[PDB]
PDB file of C-alpha atoms in Angstrom:
ATOM      1  CA  UNK A   1     -13.987   7.889  14.011  1.00 33.14           C
ATOM      2  CA  UNK A   2     -12.260   8.193  11.087  1.00 32.45           C
ATOM      3  CA  UNK A   3     -13.532  10.241   7.758  1.00 32.48           C
ATOM      4  CA  UNK A   4     -12.665   6.627   5.657  1.00 30.32           C
ATOM      5  CA  UNK A   5     -10.388   7.871   3.086  1.00 33.68           C
ATOM      6  CA  UNK A   6     -10.655   5.734  -0.439  1.00 36.15           C
ATOM      7  CA  UNK A   7      -6.917   4.305  -0.707  1.00 34.30           C
ATOM      8  CA  UNK A   8      -5.566   2.934   2.725  1.00 33.69           C
ATOM      9  CA  UNK A   9      -7.782   0.041   2.366  1.00 33.02           C
ATOM     10  CA  UNK A  10      -8.039  -0.148  -1.063  1.00 28.71           C
ATOM     11  CA  UNK A  11      -6.901  -3.591  -2.514  1.00 30.92           C
ATOM     12  CA  UNK A  12      -2.940  -3.676  -3.514  1.00 31.39           C
ATOM     13  CA  UNK A  13      -3.439  -2.638  -7.148  1.00 34.18           C
ATOM     14  CA  UNK A  14      -0.948  -5.348  -9.129  1.00 34.90           C
ATOM     15  CA  UNK A  15      -1.987  -5.541 -13.076  1.00 30.53           C
ATOM     16  CA  UNK A  16      -1.705  -2.329 -15.320  1.00 30.76           C
ATOM     17  CA  UNK A  17       1.921  -1.713 -16.509  1.00 29.30           C
ATOM     18  CA  UNK A  18       4.802  -4.937 -16.848  1.00 29.77           C
ATOM     19  CA  UNK A  19       7.345  -4.279 -13.965  1.00 30.02           C
ATOM     20  CA  UNK A  20       8.407  -6.673 -11.299  1.00 26.67           C
ATOM     21  CA  UNK A  21       9.039  -4.006  -8.589  1.00 30.01           C
ATOM     22  CA  UNK A  22       8.424  -4.304  -4.458  1.00 31.82           C
ATOM     23  CA  UNK A  23       6.417  -1.573  -3.445  1.00 34.05           C
ATOM     24  CA  UNK A  24       4.432  -2.405   0.237  1.00 34.60           C
ATOM     25  CA  UNK A  25       1.236  -2.894   0.716  1.00 34.40           C
ATOM     26  CA  UNK A  26      -1.130  -2.119   3.729  1.00 30.95           C
ATOM     27  CA  UNK A  27      -3.020  -5.063   4.281  1.00 31.29           C
ATOM     28  CA  UNK A  28      -6.414  -4.314   6.190  1.00 32.71           C
ATOM     29  CA  UNK A  29      -6.533  -8.018   7.763  1.00 31.40           C
ATOM     30  CA  UNK A  30      -3.292  -8.098   9.965  1.00 32.52           C
ATOM     31  CA  UNK A  31      -2.183  -3.995   9.700  1.00 33.13           C
ATOM     32  CA  UNK A  32       1.431  -5.064   8.275  1.00 35.21           C
ATOM     33  CA  UNK A  33       2.205  -3.736   5.142  1.00 35.81           C
ATOM     34  CA  UNK A  34       3.062  -6.772   2.933  1.00 36.08           C
ATOM     35  CA  UNK A  35       5.484  -6.339   0.444  1.00 36.73           C
ATOM     36  CA  UNK A  36       3.667  -7.093  -3.713  1.00 38.35           C
ATOM     37  CA  UNK A  37       5.116  -7.312  -7.327  1.00 35.38           C
ATOM     38  CA  UNK A  38       3.851  -4.231  -8.081  1.00 35.89           C
ATOM     39  CA  UNK A  39       2.824  -3.479 -11.843  1.00 37.86           C
ATOM     40  CA  UNK A  40       4.042  -0.191 -12.066  1.00 38.83           C
ATOM     41  CA  UNK A  41       2.878   2.480 -14.569  1.00 39.55           C
ATOM     42  CA  UNK A  42      -1.492   3.289 -13.544  1.00 39.06           C
ATOM     43  CA  UNK A  43      -2.987   1.914 -10.167  1.00 40.38           C
ATOM     44  CA  UNK A  44      -3.838   3.537  -6.489  1.00 41.90           C
ATOM     45  CA  UNK A  45      -2.454   6.064  -4.398  1.00 43.08           C
ATOM     46  CA  UNK A  46      -1.801   3.317  -1.858  1.00 40.93           C
ATOM     47  CA  UNK A  47       1.754   2.789  -3.013  1.00 38.59           C
ATOM     48  CA  UNK A  48       4.408   2.348  -0.470  1.00 38.57           C
ATOM     49  CA  UNK A  49       8.306   1.800  -1.271  1.00 35.27           C
ATOM     50  CA  UNK A  50       9.352   1.645   2.702  1.00 36.76           C
ATOM     51  CA  UNK A  51       7.712   0.027   6.113  1.00 39.29           C
ATOM     52  CA  UNK A  52       8.171   3.029   8.131  1.00 39.31           C
ATOM     53  CA  UNK A  53       6.327   5.321   6.013  1.00 36.61           C
ATOM     54  CA  UNK A  54       3.555   2.862   5.168  1.00 37.77           C
ATOM     55  CA  UNK A  55       2.841   2.376   9.106  1.00 36.34           C
ATOM     56  CA  UNK A  56       3.644   6.381  10.163  1.00 30.95           C
ATOM     57  CA  UNK A  57       0.511   7.138   6.871  1.00 29.97           C
ATOM     58  CA  UNK A  58      -2.485   4.993   7.447  1.00 27.68           C
ATOM     59  CA  UNK A  59      -1.613   3.910  11.097  1.00 29.24           C
ATOM     60  CA  UNK A  60      -0.092   7.375  11.934  1.00 31.18           C
ATOM     61  CA  UNK A  61       1.708   6.525  15.357  1.00 30.64           C
TER      62      UNK A  61
END
């Protein structure tokens, strides 16, 4: 059904810069966006800052 992009089901990038942030990662198992300590610079393009945007993007309802 979906084309299958390459940045919504990728593993949460957490290993590059050195900053203890808090981005919302979309879990492909439960579907809910679980916040994770994002390193910072470098990583995939799925680093959300809120939860309403994470669901409105990969879920789109």
